[PDB]
Swiss-Prot record, chain A:
Residues modified as N6-acetyllysine: K65, K115, K154
Residue span, S4 RNA-binding domain: 107-180
Glycyl lysine isopeptide (Lys-Gly) (interchain with G-Cter in SUMO2), cross-linked positions: K92, K138
Transit peptide is among the record's keywords: no
Name of this protein: Small ribosomal subunit protein uS4
UniProtKB/Swiss-Prot annotation, chain B:
Gene name of the record: RPS24
Region annotation Disordered: where it falls in the sequence: 90-124
Protein name, UniProt field: Small ribosomal subunit protein eS24
Subunit structure: Component of the small ribosomal subunit. Part of the small subunit (SSU) processome, composed of more than 70 proteins and the RNA chaperone small nucleolar RNA (snoRNA) U3.
Source organism (scientific name): Homo sapiens (Human)
Chain residue numbers at which the record places covalent cross-link Glycyl lysine isopeptide (Lys-Gly) (interchain with G-Cter in SUMO2): K35
Clinical disorder: Diamond-Blackfan anemia 3: A form of Diamond-Blackfan anemia, a congenital non-regenerative hypoplastic anemia that usually presents early in infancy. Diamond-Blackfan anemia is characterized by a moderate to severe macrocytic anemia, erythroblastopenia, and an increased risk of developing leukemia. 30 to 40% of Diamond-Blackfan anemia patients present with short stature and congenital anomalies, the most frequent being craniofacial (Pierre-Robin syndrome and cleft palate), thumb and urogenital anomalies.
Swiss-Prot record, chain C:
Family: Belongs to the TRAFAC class translation factor GTPase superfamily. Bms1-like GTPase family. TSR1 subfamily.
Protein name, per record: Pre-rRNA-processing protein TSR1 homolog
Domain of life of the organism encoding this protein: Eukaryota
Function recorded in the entry: Required during maturation of the 40S ribosomal subunit in the nucleolus.
Entry's localization field: Nucleus, Nucleolus
Species the sequence originates in: Homo sapiens (Human)
Span within the parent record: 202 to 252 of 804
From Swiss-Prot, chain D:
Family classification: Belongs to the eukaryotic ribosomal protein eS4 family.
GO cellular component, one term: cytoplasmic ribonucleoprotein granule
Subunit structure: Component of the small ribosomal subunit. Part of the small subunit (SSU) processome, composed of more than 70 proteins and the RNA chaperone small nucleolar RNA (snoRNA) U3. Identified in a IGF2BP1-dependent mRNP granule complex containing untranslated mRNAs.
Name this polypeptide is given: Small ribosomal subunit protein eS4, X isoform
Gene: RPS4X
Residue stretches making up the S4 RNA-binding domain: 41-103
Length: 180, 124, 51, 262
RNA sequence: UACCUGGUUGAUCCUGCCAGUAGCAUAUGCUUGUCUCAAAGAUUAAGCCAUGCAUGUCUAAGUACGCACGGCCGGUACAGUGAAACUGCGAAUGGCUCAUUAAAUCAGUUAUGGUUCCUUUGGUCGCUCGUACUUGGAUAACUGUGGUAAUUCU
RNA sequence: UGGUGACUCUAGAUAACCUCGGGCCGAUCGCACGCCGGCGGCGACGACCCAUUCGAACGUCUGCCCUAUCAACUUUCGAUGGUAGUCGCCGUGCCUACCAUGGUGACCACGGGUGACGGGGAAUCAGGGUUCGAUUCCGGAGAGGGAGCCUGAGAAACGGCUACCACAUCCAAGGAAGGCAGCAGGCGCGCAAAUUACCCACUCCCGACCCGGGGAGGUAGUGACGAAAAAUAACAAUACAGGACUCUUUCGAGGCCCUGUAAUUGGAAUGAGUCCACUUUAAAUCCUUUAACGAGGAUCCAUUGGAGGGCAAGUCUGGUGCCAAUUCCAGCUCCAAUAGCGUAUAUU
RNA sequence: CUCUCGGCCGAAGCGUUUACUUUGAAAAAAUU
């Protein structure tokens, strides 16, 4: 007996057929578009989408006024809207079955740092977050895959402690400036 | 200066003769503020002496702006000497513990239970 | 962590071997005990011959 | 086992205690006493995990050993003493009084009461029997025996009893149209009015209760505690008045409170 | 995501098994920068074990003439701290393993109107018509003499 | 009297009994002292009985894998039932005496096997299923194998005792002591599994107890079992190469853009490391926070496998033998996943 | 679906008995 929990989950699925050209090319498309480190981030987002689709299908097998359908559909729709993947005017479960991996890829912190003009590229965005220059609200966030909510979209900025931000010069610049 | 103290979840615990709260410390570009400095800051905040103030369990957040810990102010030094743990009372120099290991005490105990009578006090 | 590196430095030639520490008399007794009770590698050449 | 078990694992503790998984291997293990193990709140869980006067069990012992805690008017120094339904906890140093009555979700409310309401308690009578020299005795739900009860008091009635004297002050019969709180099963904590009692000989009777909104629910007769006469309760009720809201209405009231306050 | 690729014929379709593939366990090889959690002598041998530790315990409230310490006030039995020892309680919990065990164990359901129960909590505790302003003998710790190679022996 | 669904229940009355190996009816201890020798307030400990609590133990109903190369079994020696008793905490062939001849079985008894402790549960998952569950929760069982007791409320107890069987320790040879399927650790076995560390601070348990103790438990150590996040570069100019758009029928021009590729230049940003201080904690460590140093081949250098018969991936090179074809060896190039990736075996 | 006694109803026999379906009570946590 120990005061430990052993509850833990794999968060991705390896595909059944390893070598098919269309899936490889589409994965490479997404990796290049979004600056992902490897195929496993594609598999991770694909997994969360598959989970959400299974939940929506099992809710849709229920009859229309079933209270579990109303409660759990409202919760699922509210969460998908809250991370900005579904529009607010599309609170219908069937629209969940229309989504794509690219939406949850657009809601990453890497992509939102790229689209807000703090970075010159998507790879510059991953590097910018990973090196403690990006802060959401007033919290330094180091994780590229941090999914940004709609109330947190207008609050992504530069760390008040970063050289590009508040302004203490970095290690290289302070080394070079003291040579002369 | 730039280190500010706020107290969040204040409670006047009249059963353990103290006031206990969560202490939130802001130090935007420094390290984690030492516990003694927080103790004079709480002594200035609550209009008292800092030898009855005990703070513990501070964790700095990721990013460095903020550190949360717990603190409690005792009415007197006597209630502090009664109701505080011995180790927190030792961190302030008010208690000194015995310098013997478990192996030494346990072997002494098992050795002196092979002896009957007041010769028990002669076993090392 | 010194010992950590040491184990790795050893593992290119001694792959699965325990690094005893010989600093004190108590550790010397532990090593002597480990040496007395341990399975013996038998070398065929000297075992077929009286030496 | 070769004799009584003395320990309680944390994951085997009662769920309504609301203990978390990673604090320890063990749960506080109530002592034997006036309430069952699965239907009690030990004093350490109340005074540490609910009221937060103490942060560890050691200073729970420090609060207890100063004789600041009373259950039903008596100083209880044991930190795992089993307190249960309708118990009146008095802490006169802080000047606070509590009654241990259930939430609508089946957990022991932190329910603060008036010092005037701390004087009495309601006990469900659990058996009546005649002892030597023809003396009627009454055994309640928390192991009280009262000599010479009123002859009108039968089993399953509720007696209002005075904590200082230990003598019966009043009683309520088990009738229809009469107010009860559920003390077990899936409907635990709900408060309503008895409408029916379908008797099953050699088996358990089932009592039908109607909520203040019109919701109807049944329980076993052992799960019924009469708490008022007709429609008005004889004690203070907690915030939720025994009306179990559905999860949709819980979500709606939570969002309405967020929108109104914030 | 209710998914495929190949293998017998000169060539075609079939049956039919297999190979690839994917997951889960054990092991193992090569490699390994950071950080969070985290299983871990079950499988074979319920095989065999050196050494150490794993179970003890005192409040104002059972027994203090150990100066082992320690103030009175002096006829005041006993200030107070208190090792030892007697007495009481615990050692039937916890921890380990899976050998046994196949309507046995075990789960759900019921019963004790067929039983016991330390303890906690409540009741009962002048309900008996018949030296007490206090009863008796011991035995430890302690002092002293010892036996045996050897024991938590005496 | 009172109760139950049902008492031979509870309570009542009478005649008595009441075990010396004996049933209650207080020769106990502390703290404050006060009233009219007598009256006393809080407690502590004991205690017959009844209730309660924690159980425990016997029963009820339903539910388990493989085997007929196990078809009849139990019954003298209790197998099924009856009466009376014994014993037990109690109901009962539990045991005894005498009777009755019963009881179970192809709806699979009885016997044997299981790489069988049982459940909660795990993997797969359209669904039905198939496979797994020694293992932290619940229930059982055992302490080398059997057997029998003592104390106690509770044990057929093994960190209790007494024997025998198998092992084994010390000895002055007369004697004495034993039981890691507890925590470490060792030997053996094997394909196969960590430190003879620190602490009662946490969780809780026990005791006369706020105070002592706890290899339970917590903490570090070993740990690529497994699961989570996640570095190994980014940008600008320059030079070529594409692709758009303006002007030209086109060639062409675009200080017109955009996108790639560099034995090309450039300083900006930083961790990995090294190392003060806090913080952490029982004391530490780690993490988190922060000084200082810390990057150009940023040598601070990513591996593991597979490809020239099909899923992803070759019209390649050099040695070596055999009669241009052709056994063995070392490479290049490409593809896949990536701090991970092959293999064996089992299983789905 | 009814026959009696007590306040249009409550008790009683149920109506051949089942298999089936539904409801209600009750049914550890952890895991999912």
């Amino acid at each position: 007996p120990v005061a430990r929990s052993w509850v833990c989950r794999k968060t991705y699925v390896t595909p059944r057929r390893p070598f098919e050209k269309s899936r490889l090319d589409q994965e490479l498309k997404l990796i290049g578009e979004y600056g992902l480190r490897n195929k496993r981030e594609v598999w991770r987002v694909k997994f969360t989408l598959a989970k959400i689709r299974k939940a929506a299908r099992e809710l849709l097998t229920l009859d229309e006024k079933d209270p579990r359908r109303l409660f759990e559909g409202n919760a699922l729709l509210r969460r998908l809207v809250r991370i900005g993947v579904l529009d607010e005017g599309k609170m219908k479960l069937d629209y969940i079955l229309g989504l794509k991996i690219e939406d949850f890829l657009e809601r990453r912190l890497q992509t939102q740092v790229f689209k807000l003009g703090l970075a010159k590229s998507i790879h510059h965005a991953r590097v910018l977050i990973r090196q403690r220059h990006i802060r959401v609200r007033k919290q330094v966030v180091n994780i590229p895959s941090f999914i940004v909510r709609l109330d947190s979209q207008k609050h992504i900025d530069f760390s008040l402690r970063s050289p590009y931000g508040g302004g203490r010069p970095g290690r290289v610049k302070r080394k070079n400036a003291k040579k002369g | 200066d730039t280190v500010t103290i706020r107290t969040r979840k204040f409670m006047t615990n009249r059963l353990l003769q103290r006031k206990q709260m969560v202490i939130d410390v802001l130090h935007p570009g420094k390290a984690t503020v030492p516990k003694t400095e927080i103790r004079e800051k709480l002594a200035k905040m609550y209009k008292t002496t800092p030898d009855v103030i005990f703070v513990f369990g501070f964790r700095t957040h990721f990013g460095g702006g903020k550190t949360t810990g717990f603190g409690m102010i005792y009415d007197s030094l006597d209630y502090a000497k009664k109701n505080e743990p011995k180790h927190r009372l030792a961190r302030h120099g008010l208690y000194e513990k015995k310098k013997t290991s478990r192996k030494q005490r346990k072997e002494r105990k098992n050795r002196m239970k092979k002896v009957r009578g007041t010769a028990k006090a002669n076993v090392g | 962590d010194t010992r950590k590196k040491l184990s790795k430095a050893v593992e290119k030639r001694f792959p699965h071997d325990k690094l005893l520490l010989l600093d004190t008399q108590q550790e010397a007794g532990m090593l002597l005990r480990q040496l007395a009770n341990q399975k013996q590698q038998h070398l065929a050449f000297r075992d077929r011959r009286a030496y | 086992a070769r004799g009584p078990k003395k320990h309680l694992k944390r994951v085997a503790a009662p769920k309504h205690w609301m203990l978390d998984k990673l604090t320890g291997v063990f749960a506080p293990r109530p002592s034997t006493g006036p309430h069952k193990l699965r239907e009690c709140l030990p004093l350490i869980i109340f005074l540490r995990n609910r009221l937060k006067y103490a942060l560890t069990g050691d200073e729970v012992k420090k609060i207890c050993m100063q004789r600041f805690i009373k259950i039903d008017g008596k100083v209880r120094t044991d930190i795992t003493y089993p307190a249960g339904f309708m118990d009146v906890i008095s802490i006169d140093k802080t000047g606070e009084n509590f009654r241990l009555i259930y939430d609508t979700k089946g957990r022991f409310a932190v329910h603060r009461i008036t010092p005037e309401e701390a004087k009495y308690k309601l006990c469900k009578v659990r058996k009546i029997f005649v002892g030597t020299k023809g003396i009627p005795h009454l055994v309640t739900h928390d192991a009280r025996t009262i000599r010479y009860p009123d002859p009108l008091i039968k089993v399953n009635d509720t007696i209002q009893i005075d904590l200082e004297t230990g003598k019966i002050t009043d009683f309520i019969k088990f009738d229809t149209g009469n107010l009860c709180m559920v003390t077990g099963g899936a409907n635990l904590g709900r408060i309503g009015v008895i409408t029916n009692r379908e008797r099953h000989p050699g088996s358990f009777d089932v009592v039908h209760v109607k909520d203040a909104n019109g919701n109807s629910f049944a329980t076993r007769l052992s799960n019924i505690f009469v708490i008022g006469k007709g429609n008005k309760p004889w004690i203070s009720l907690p915030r939720g008045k025994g009306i179990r809201l559905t999860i949709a209405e819980e979500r709606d009231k939570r969002l309405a409170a967020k929108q109104s306050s914030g």
